[PDB]
Design a protein around this ligand. Sequence first.
Ligand SMILES: CCCCCCCCOCCOCCOCCOCCO
Length: 172
Amino acid sequence: MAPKDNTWYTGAKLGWSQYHDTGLINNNGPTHENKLGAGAFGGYQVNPYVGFEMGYDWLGRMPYKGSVENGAYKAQGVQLTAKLGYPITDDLDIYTRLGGMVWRADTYSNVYGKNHDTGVSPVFAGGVEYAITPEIATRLEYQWTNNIGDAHTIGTRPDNGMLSLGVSYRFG
Ligand SMILES: CCCCCCCCOCCOCCOCCOCCO
């Protein structure tokens, strides 16, 4: 049950990412990592199979071990994607999103202070959308970015996936 033919929708999501990066010195510094965040998205449906959406997401590193040492991590990004779906039932859609994202990571260190980073990256998602009612739908989605990137020195990697639950309102 995708949104009706030339209509708009909006929504919000809560996300979790199990590690969107990772650090190290021989010698270990943190123990493992968790990021939690949220995001908002809006889109336009063209027909039952295709829509286009815009979203903004934010992720924050969650505080959890000591052993001296580390600090704050925040990521944010605006994305523009084409959403391709197929109706499995009258209520359940399966879809993928493909497009691009402009992001920014802001770090912090006690030694080094504040640092930032910027990027442009392809984004991909696979998910399920369930129409509770004709105006309210929930989504279960896994989003990933594959990373290649221009820079430094020479590129290697690790951005990882984000899992999320969302709700959206359809202005039919
Ligand atoms: C993958 C890149 C994103 C490309 C998608 C952009 C899609 C843009 O078009 C969306 C449709 O928006 C058009 C509506 O405006 C019509 C208003 O009413 C007309 C006067 O009565």
